Each structure stands twice: as C-alpha cells, then as structure tokens.
C-alpha cells in the first residue's frame, strides 16, 4: 500500500511510466524512485536478451 | 593564546592537481620566517576618444598575487639533527615539475592563525627558488643554508565559482518596510544582481496586481 | 513566504529517511454529494459558496497543487460531518482522495495520518539539513564520490589546544565553501565543555545565499 | 558510543568577560516565577535557559538582542497570571526590594519596563493622565537608587494625551528620564499571524549600548536605523505637538523613504532652557566622567591627606581628561577651555575640611552640542 | 581649529559604479599616514616639418594622476584590539575586483580638511 | 628527568646554595617543555611550579634526617575524544 | 604499471583512486576491473593484490 497509493493498480502506474508527460512533474517522489530504478535495469535486460 | 603557548610552525604542502585531491608531500619549516610580503598589482589602459573630452581608463588583466619568504636551515647548533640536504631536497621536490602532469605542483602554505587575505592558506605555485650555502663541514656537509621562495597565486576553480555566486547571487530576496516604493525596492534588490532590475520586471516576477500591491513585512524576490 | 523560499532553494527528501502510509478510506460510506446534501437539508445558498470556499482553502494549505473535482458525505454522519474529497494534482490525470471533517463560519479539518510517502525538506530546512549531512559524512564513504564529506575524524584524539581549535574552524569553512553553495558561514565558535573536558562543542552560524 | 563526531542540538554557555558602559535591566512579569535576584543574560540562549520563550518580556529581550545588544539584566516582578491593570503595575514598581536589588548591582545603567504596553489606552480622561505621571515618577525613583542610571520611558499611544502629560509633568528628576514614541510593529508574529507590537525602548537600549563602543558616549544615539521593525504604529504627522524647544518634549521614532525607521530625537525630560542636561548624550558623558573619577578617587581613601597625595590625584585626573579631550569628547580649542581640575588646601579646601577628614576636588567641563536644526540661506554673488 | 581638537581619521570607501550610486564598504585607518604624494604627468610630441623652421610640440594624452600612501596596522600595543587580519581583509576587499561588474571597485579617499 | 637531575645532588651539602642550583635548572627545563606545547597554560605560573626550601617544602627535622624534598606541580593537556557540532541559522 | 594491495572495507572506486594516483592518466573502476579479470565489481578479498596499467 506504500508503493501503490490507495486505489492504484500496476496497470495505472505502467501507463504513467510509459508516458512521462501525463504527470507533469507531480508524481509522488517515492514512485519516481521506483520508475528511475526500472530504467536502470533496462540496460541489463537488453544485454542479456542478446 | 587561550589554552597553551606552543609555537606554530609554517608548513608547505604539495598537490598534483588544482583542487588538491592527490597529495604529493609536505615539509615543515624548522625556523619560521620573520617577514612575509604579499603583492597585488592591477593594470589599466587609458581611453582615447576623438569626440569625447572625458578622462577615464578601463581595466586590463591583473597579474596574479605574489608571495615571498626566506627560510633558514641549520645543522650545526645542538638540537638541530635533521640534515640540511634532506630538508633542501624535500623543499625543491615540492616546487619541481611533476613527472605525471608535466607541470609544477600546486602548493599550500599554512601557518597557525595567520590569514593570507581572508583564507588560512596561500594557494599557488613556485616561481623562484634561490639557495645560498654559507657554512660547510670538513667533509663538505652543508651546515647552514638559506632559501628564498616566491610563489604566484593559483586558486581552485570550485572555490572561485562558489564565492562568485555568493556575492552575486542568481536570485535575491528583499523584505518590504514602511514607506517603500517599487523603484526603491528594485534598487535595493537589484544592487547585488549582476544586471540590476527594473520596477516593471520586478513587479512581473512577483505577480503583483499593481505597482503598489505589497504590504510592510512582505518579502519579494528578484531574479537575473 | 515558505513557498517563496522553497522554490528558490529547492526541495527534496528529508534526512534521516522516513516513511508514512495513510489510513484506509472506507469507500462504502461516501455515496452522497455534498452540495445536494446541503441543499436538501435546507441550508442557505449563500452558505454553500462559503462552505465550498472553506473546503478549497483547507485543501490548498494541505496541498497547493490540488484541484477539487468531487465532494461526498459519510452516511454515518447525518448532521461533525465526514467528507471524502477527490482532487487532481495540477493538469495531470492522477487523482487522489482525502478525508476531512466539516463543522457548521464553516470550519474544515483534515485527518492527521492521511499522507502516504516520504518526508520532504523545503527551503531553509533543505539547506540546514544539507550542511548536517556534510558533517556526518566522511570522505571515502560515498560510492563513486570518494571526496564528498567534511572529514572531522582526522582531528580526534589530538591535544585540545589553540592549534586544534584553529584547524577545526578553518577546515569547516573550506569544506562548506566547496560542497554547499547555497549557504554562507558567518561565524564558527569552538569551545571545550566544562563538565566533559575531553569533548569540543562547535557552534556554526549560517546565512542563506542572497537572503539580505 | 565510541569516540566520534556527532551532531547535537545542545548549547554551551561559556563565561564572558566583556564590559559595556550602558547595560539595561528589563523589569516586568515573566513567563515563570523566579527569585528576587537579577539574572544576567549574554544572549537569547540564556533567556531560554531561565524562562520559556513566550510572553511580552521574551519578545522585548529578543528585540534587544537582534538590534545589536550584547548584555542585559532581567528582573521579574512575578508570573504573568498576576497582571491585572495599570495601577497594579505602578504599585508593583513602587515596591521596596526593587531599589536594593538595583543598587546592589553595579552593572545596571538603564531601566526598561516592557509591561506598560499591555493595558488598554482607549480613554483620554484625566485619571489616565495622572496614572502616566505616576509611572514616570516611579521609574525615576528607581533611577535615584544609584548615580548614573536613567530610565527609558513610554508615552501614551494617543498623541493628545501624551502632549498633556508632557506639559503637566513636574519633578526634580527630569534629567534622568528619556521618553520615546510611538509603539513599534515588530517583525515577529503570534499564533494568529498578527504582528507583535513592542515598545521602542527595547531597541533604543541596544542602540545606546552599541553606539558607546562604536562612536563614543559623547555621541548622540539618534539618527540610527532600527532592525526587525516593520512600521511605527502612528505616522510622523501626528506628533507636531510633542516637540517643544522651550519645554518638555519626546524623542520621535520615524520612518523615511529609503532610510527605514530611525530614532529622531536625543532630548531628555529636562525642560529648563538653560539647564545643561537637556540631551541624553550630555547626561551620559558626565556620568561616564563621574564614574572614572569615582574609581580614581577610591584609590586615595584612607590615605594621608597631604600635598603629595593631592598631586597624585591631580596629575592622573589631568592626564585622563586631556586624553578624552584629544578624542573629541570635550569642547574647546585650548586645554584650559576644555577642563580644569582644582585640588588643594586653599584652592578648593580649608583647614576645617582637612580636620573633618574630607578631600574636595573641583572639576569643570565643557561639552558639545548636537546639531538639531540646519538652516540654509541662499544669496546671489554681487559680482 | 574652531570648536574642538579631535583627530580626523583617513577613510577609504568603495563603490561598484563610477558615479558612486552603490556603496560596497568602508574602512577607517587606525593610523593616519605621515606623508602623501600626488603625481601628475603629461606628454608632448615634437612637430617635424619639411618647410617650417618653427620649434613647437603638440600635446599627447596625459596619464592619469597617481596617489600613494603607506598605512600601518598594529595589534600589540594597549588599546589596539581590532585584529590586523580583519583590517587587512577589509582593505583588500575594497580594492579587489567586484564579482558583479568584473572590474575593480571605485574608491574615494577623504581625510578631514 | 627530575630523577636524573636529582641524582647529581646526592651526597652534596644540604644548604640554600644547593637548592638554588636544582631549582634554577628544574625551572629552566620545565619551561622549555612548556614553550614546546607539552604543558597547558597561558601563563608560566599556570603551567608549572617548583618549590624547594627550608620552609617552603621542608622543615628543620627533614634536614637533620638527611632528606631533600622538592614539590612540583604540573598542568597537562586533554585529548579531543568527542566533537559535537551545533548548527543554527543567523537571525538576520 | 602499478600494483596495489587490498585492505579491509575497500571498494573498487577507492582502489582505482589509490592505484591511479601514480599513473599519468589515472584509471576508472571499470577499466581496473577488466584488467584484473574480476568476475564482478566486488570480486576481491583482503590481502589480494591488483594491478593497474596506463
């Protein structure tokens, strides 16, 4: 309930992560922390898939 | 003094880089210098005009500040057991060209509570070193020698940048007092700014409803 | 004025890190519009705009980016009122809900433990906290940042003397200049405690950049 | 718990050995009860150590320390729950132990009562005028407990009432009283976010203490900007009856466009035209001279009363006075014009005085006059 | 003198601009200098002519006037409590380059009559 | 050191001249250590004191027994084990 | 080429700073790891020796 605030679903957060504009810099900071970490792991996933 | 009466000794430290991240060595003077000279110079060029009779000169690049010391090394009197050659070898090695960077080391001079124009250290590089040997032993061991040392200031870029944005902040804040007008606030707020500020720009930045839309005790801001 | 300072000096996570989870909203209690309830209970129509203004003002203090979109009444409070407020942050599509208590001038209060997230430091508190972190960090502790830190551990176990007090004061001045451009150190006082002779007390006074 | 570097919120209170010519004492009701002694404060931290950080006394002391003050005294009349009305405060200031406590303390030089502002001032009746006259006399009686102390006084908020008090005040202690007007709207805020109204005397005391080290005790403390002041309560246009060049007058506190809020007066309550104590800096300079001669004179008590002793005093007193004259502290182009010291068996004493055990020293001084008015006459060069 | 015999002290004031509309700081000398020198120079170029035997020279730009002082700072004798480092730090900062204008400050020297 | 200095005065006459020879040298050496930062004090009398005399440190009975008593007082320095920093905002 | 000895509570960026001090152009933690054939950025133990080239 901390990473997903109240009535939030992973589907909703995934939509925000794909389109950064629809938050206009007002996403809660701790969720922006999670999105930043997921961006970091993308490079490792790309290398493995080769 | 406040606690004890120990004698502070002058120290010379050498670094490879300008920011002092890689220490190279250090040397503590065995005798404190009895006089220190600081020199500041700045050059101006006169303005020549064909249609103006004004007399004025504009600023041209000022040479870096200079420092001068004389150190004495002795190995003859009782209690002076550190050889003179060892101290002179260390002193020159700190002022010499670094084999890695191919440029002379960056030096720092520290001495107790002495302040070298607002800082506890003089940051610079050696520009001259003269050693005079005046007394020798029977096996030609040098017993007395004096070194004249002169440096030119070479400060760190990070400290210069911070001090620059401190005295000339990008954004300044002012407090409104009684019987102040908007042009007066702009003069006070715009004094620290590099380019100043006009009363219209100041009003727009603060979202004022009119030119008198402020009350005493309120705070206003002024950007570049 | 706290908003003005926060914008100038920035805002970020508070130190040490703290975490909160707000209380759960009993969604099965708010199924009645506030305005329709007020009109049905024969409240003054001049009261309603005052009521709504009170809700908007109280929410704005709680979060000034909020934009109220809905208002509902708890069915267990039929004239002390429990209100569930729905708002959107700025121009985003994110929507959040918050509980409140309305009292009939009208007064609106917010539930205490309603925020989920981290604690943030703003404006002056951000700069004050920034200097505090610098003192508690020694160089070499930060990964890939092996120079960040004050480095006062090098002066421990040294004899308490005028030389040590001078060295501590000048060391603080140099490190704050290097690693905290938003603050200006105005004075440093070093004193020895009478009840604990082996401890040193350092008093540091700072001013904000462009404050005057 | 190993040796380490740590962050603390504690505070240290080292002993301070600095000295100042003018040290005020704050007499009024404080947050918490204390004994009958006077507490010395070196900063705002010391006040928090003894009293909670709330109430009128806290903000008056805070206003003093933020205006350049360095050392102050606090004398508590009781807890804040004993505040009833104006007349009760006057009675409390008339107690007996106050004079003994003030006299026993040699550091105190100024007197401030911050609690005069609390009470209502909506009636301009003659009962209020008499009450204000009593308060000034009560404070001045405290100043008489020891030579050199002066009291910084408040005035009624209504200018018409204040002008009435000045005309009808009668006392032989005028030279020890200085009054400032009007109240000031400080930069501090209370729970309802309203500005806190403070008496100007708190900030003036810090200015006087600061001005002594900077400019000198012989320099008028007027025309100095205040700090942490938003605006005076009333504008300067309401004080045209409060300055009398040939009578009692107030020292106005005024704001200027671009100059802030400044003190605009240096007179005392001395209304006599030819009196020498019409200015605060003149009264303070002579007391500063008196204090030194008292200290120098004490070294010759229980000493033989002969010509050798008199020369030792006369040589040193003449030495100190000339050093003050060459610093601009006394008026005169010649040394004999600035001062003169007389001490002898026939210059100042008689053989009867020697038999009584007395030693009489005559000292004359010439003081400087502040520039209050400047008139410019503009004429055309007849060429 | 005419009224009193106080000792006037030399003062140094700094400004950001040429007209002195923005003050920066001030410093009052703790010891007046015992000598002050003022220097004026002006240069002329001789006139060369192929048909005139006249001897004359024409005025070329004159360097600006120079002033020189020596100030002494002491912190050892009784009554000298202001630290030497503070006074020297203030003195240089008035003579240094302004961080806003990138040019050295404009100075004013006043001393009594 | 004082043991080494004291050994040179064993079997010596126990008079005032001998005491001055010891007191002069002992005062000399401790003072040199004080000026090197080895003792705590801003005044010389605060750092150390040496007492040696027929009434300052001994009695006539002590002389008869053949004793020689020297009183030495020292002030030492304290290490810096803990450093606390209190950071406050400048009220201006 | 320079050689360094690993002590307690050392990290790869710390090792590269000490090893790279004597080198003309320094060294980065990735290059230092590659030259020593480390399996990961923490694949070293106290008492082990590491080498750094230009």
């Amino acid at each position: 309930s901390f990473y997903f605030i109240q009535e939030n679903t992973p589907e909703e957060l995934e939509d925000i992560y794909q389109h950064a504009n629809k938050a206009d810099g007002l996403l809660p900071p701790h969720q922006a922390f999670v999105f930043a970490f997921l961006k970091l792991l993308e490079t490792s996933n790309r290398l493995l898939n080769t | 003094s406040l606690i004890e009466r120990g004698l502070s000794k002058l120290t010379l430290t050498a670094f490879k880089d300008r920011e002092g991240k890689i220490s190279v060595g250090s040397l503590q003077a065995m005798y404190n210098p009895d006089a220190i000279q600081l020199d500041y110079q700045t050059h101006y060029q006169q303005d020549e005009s064909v249609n103006h009779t004004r007399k004025s000169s504009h600023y041209v690049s000022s040479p870096p500040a200079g420092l001068s010391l004389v150190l004495l090394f002795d190995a003859s009197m009782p209690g002076n057991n550190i050889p003179v050659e060892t101290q002179l070898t260390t002193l020159k090695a700190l002022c010499a060209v670094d084999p890695s960077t191919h440029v002379p080391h960056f030096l720092k001079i520290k001495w107790g509570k002495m302040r070298w124009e607002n800082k506890s250290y003089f940051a610079g590089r050696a520009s001259g070193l003269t050693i005079n040997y005046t007394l020798f032993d029977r096996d030609a061991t040098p017993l007395r020698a004096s070194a004249t040392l002169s440096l030119v200031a070479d400060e760190s870029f990070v400290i210069q940048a911070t001090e620059q944005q401190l005295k000339s902040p990008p954004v300044t804040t002012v407090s409104v007092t009684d019987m102040l007008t908007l042009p007066l606030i702009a003069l006070g707020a715009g004094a620290s700014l590099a380019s100043g500020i006009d009363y219209l720009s100041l009003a727009w930045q603060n979202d004022l409803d009119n030119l008198d839309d402020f009350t005493p005790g309120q705070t206003l801001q002024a950007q570049e | 004025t706290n908003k003005i300072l926060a914008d100038i000096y920035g805002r970020g996570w508070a130190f040490p890190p703290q975490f909160f989870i707000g209380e759960r909203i009993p969604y099965e209690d708010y199924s009645s519009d506030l305005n329709k309830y007020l009109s049905e209970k024969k409240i003054e129509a001049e009261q309603i705009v005052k009521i709504q203004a009170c809700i908007k003002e109280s929410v704005m203090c709680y979060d000034f980016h909020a934009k109220i979109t809905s208002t509902q009444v708890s069915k267990q409070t039929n004239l002390p009122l429990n209100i569930l407020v729905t708002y959107t942050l700025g121009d985003s599509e994110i929507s959040q809900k918050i509980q409140g208590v309305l009292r009939v001038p009208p007064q609106f209060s917010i539930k205490d433990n309603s925020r989920t997230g981290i604690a943030i430091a703003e404006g002056t508190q951000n700069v004050l906290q920034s200097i505090n972190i610098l003192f508690l960090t020694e160089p070499g502790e930060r990964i890939m940042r092996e120079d960040y830190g004050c480095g006062l551990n090098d002066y421990l176990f040294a004899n308490i003397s005028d030389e040590l007090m001078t060295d501590i004061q000048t060391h603080i001045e140099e490190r704050v200049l290097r690693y905290e451009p938003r603050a200006e150190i105005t004075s440093i006082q070093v004193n020895q405690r009478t009840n604990l002779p082996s401890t040193l007390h350092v008093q540091v006074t700072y001013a904000l950049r462009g404050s005057d | 718990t190993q040796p380490s570097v740590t962050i603390t919120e504690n505070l240290i209170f080292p002993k301070q050995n600095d000295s100042f010519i003018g040290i005020p004492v704050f007499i009024g009701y404080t947050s918490s009860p204390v004994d009958k002694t006077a507490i010395k404060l070196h900063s705002l931290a010391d006040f928090a150590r003894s009293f909670p950080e709330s109430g009128l006394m806290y903000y008056s002391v805070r206003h003093f320390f933020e205006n350049g003050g360095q050392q102050a005294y606090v004398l508590s009349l009781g807890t804040e729950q004993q505040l009833s009305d104006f007349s009760s405060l006057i009675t409390a200031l008339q107690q007996a132990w106050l004079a003994q406590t003030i006299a026993a303390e040699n550091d105190i030089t100024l007197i401030i009562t911050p609690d005069v502002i609390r009470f209502d001032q909506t009636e301009i009746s003659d009962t209020q005028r008499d009450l204000w006259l009593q308060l000034w006399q009560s404070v001045l009686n405290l100043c008489k407990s020891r030579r050199g102390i002066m009291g910084l006084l408040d005035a009624p908020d209504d200018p018409t009432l204040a002008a009435k008090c000045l005309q009808q005040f009668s006392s032989a202690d005028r030279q020890w009283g200085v009054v400032y007007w009007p109240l000031l709207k400080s930069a501090y805020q209370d729970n309802t976010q309203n500005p806190i109204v403070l008496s100007p005397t708190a900030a003036v005391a810090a200015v006087i203490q600061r001005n002594d080290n900077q400019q000198g005790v012989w320099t008028a403390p007027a025309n100095i900007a205040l700090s942490k002041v938003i605006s005076p309560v009333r504008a300067y246009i309401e004080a045209n009856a409060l300055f009398n060049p040939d009578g009692t007058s107030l020292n106005l506190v005024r704001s200027f466009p671009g100059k802030g809020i400044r003190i605009w007066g240096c007179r005392t309550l001395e209304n006599t035209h030819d009196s020498p104590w019409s200015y605060i800096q003149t009264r303070r300079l002579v007391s500063y001279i008196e204090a030194y001669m008292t200290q120098l004179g004490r070294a010759f008590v229980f000493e033989p009363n002969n010509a050798i002793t008199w020369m030792k005093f006369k040589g040193q007193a003449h030495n100190w006075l000339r050093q003050l004259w060459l610093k601009g502290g006394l008026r005169g182009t010649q040394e004999d014009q600035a001062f003169e010291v007389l001490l002898g068996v026939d210059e100042s004493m008689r053989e009867a005085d020697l038999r009584a055990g007395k030693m009489i020293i005559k000292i004359r001084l010439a003081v400087l006059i502040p520039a209050e008015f400047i008139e410019l006459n503009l004429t055309f060069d007849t060429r």
Side-chain angles (χ1 to χ4, degrees), chain D residues 125-324:
Chain D
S125 80
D126 288 280
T127 314
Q128 298 304 310
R129 179 209 65 200
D130 280 344
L131 276 167
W132 276 101
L133 291 192
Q134 261 183 86
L135 165 89
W136 295 358
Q137 191 59 80
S138 302
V139 177
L140 289 167
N141 286 338
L142 279 170
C143 303
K144 276 188 299 195
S145 73
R146 167 164 54 83
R147 285 284 288 203
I149 306 174
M150 316 183 329
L152 309 188
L153 297 166
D154 293 277
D157 184 77
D158 186 71
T160 83
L161 185 52
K164 255 152 50 78
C165 292
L166 297 168
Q167 294 154 359
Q168 278 148 64
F169 183 62
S170 185
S171 182
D173 306 319
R174 282 169 176 271
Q175 71 193 282
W176 307 103
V178 192
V179 195
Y180 295 90
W181 183 93
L183 310 183
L184 303 183
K185 210 166 293 169
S186 71
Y188 317 124
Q189 280 179 348
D190 77 316
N191 308 106
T192 170
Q193 282 71 82
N194 278 108
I196 301 175
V197 168
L198 292 176
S199 175
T201 56
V204 174
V207 165
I208 285 174
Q209 177 178 97
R210 217 180 57 227
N211 189 86
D212 284 356
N213 282 17
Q214 260 145 41
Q215 297 276 306
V217 75
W218 54 91
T219 287
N223 204 342
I224 293 175
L226 303 188
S227 267
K228 299 303 188 321
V229 175
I230 279 178
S231 177
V233 166
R234 294 176 183 262
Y236 72 82
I237 64 187
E238 309 174 53
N240 215 243
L242 308 181
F243 186 79
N244 304 338
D246 39 7
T248 321
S249 56
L250 295 189
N251 297 308
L252 175 69
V253 181
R254 172 177 185 179
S255 39
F256 297 91
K259 312 290 282 188
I261 292 87
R262 336 197 99 186
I263 307 161
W264 207 247
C266 61
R267 294 191 176 223
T268 71
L269 290 169
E270 202 56 73
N271 80 273
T272 299
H273 165 237
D274 58 288
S275 192
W277 319 120
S278 47
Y279 303 114
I280 177 181
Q281 75 263 19
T282 290
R283 183 62 256 175
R284 295 195 77 240
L285 172 62
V286 178
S287 302
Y288 171 75
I289 295 176
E290 274 171 29
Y292 177 78
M293 296 294 153
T294 293
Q295 154 178 314
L296 181 63
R298 268 178 200 135
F300 297 103
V301 190
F302 304 120
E303 290 288 301
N305 212 1
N306 50 31
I308 280 166
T309 292
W310 308 334
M311 210 67 245
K312 282 189 263 204
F313 187 96
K314 180 150 44 142
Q316 174 71 93
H318 184 286
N319 197 336
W320 187 84
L321 272 166
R322 210 197 27 260
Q323 267 174 77
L324 179 73

Side-chain angles (χ1 to χ4, degrees), chain C residues 2 5-6 9-16 18 119-133 180 182-183 206 208:
Chain C
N2 50 311
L5 299 186
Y9 297 112
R11 56 199 95 162
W13 291 40
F15 181 83
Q18 291 147 70
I120 58 143
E122 270 166 345
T124 302
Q125 261 294 329
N126 199 258
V127 186
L128 172 89
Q129 158 197 289
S130 172
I131 303 170
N132 267 350
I133 299 166
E180 192 36 85
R182 293 178 299 168
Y206 81 102
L208 292 171

Side-chain angles (χ1 to χ4, degrees), chain C residues 128 152 156-158 160 186 198-206:
Chain C
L128 172 89
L152 281 164
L156 295 184
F157 303 103
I160 287 180
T186 57
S198 57
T199 86
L200 286 172
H201 186 93
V202 186
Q203 190 74 35
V204 181
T205 325
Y206 81 102

Side-chain angles (χ1 to χ4, degrees), chain D residues 26-52:
Chain D
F26 291 86
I27 302 172
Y29 297 94
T30 70
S31 306
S32 48
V34 295
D35 56 46
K36 304 295 191 65
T37 47
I39 313 119
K40 185 165 78 170
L41 315 178
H42 288 101
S43 70
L44 201 55
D46 311 39
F47 188 89
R49 192 147 50 107
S50 304
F51 311 93

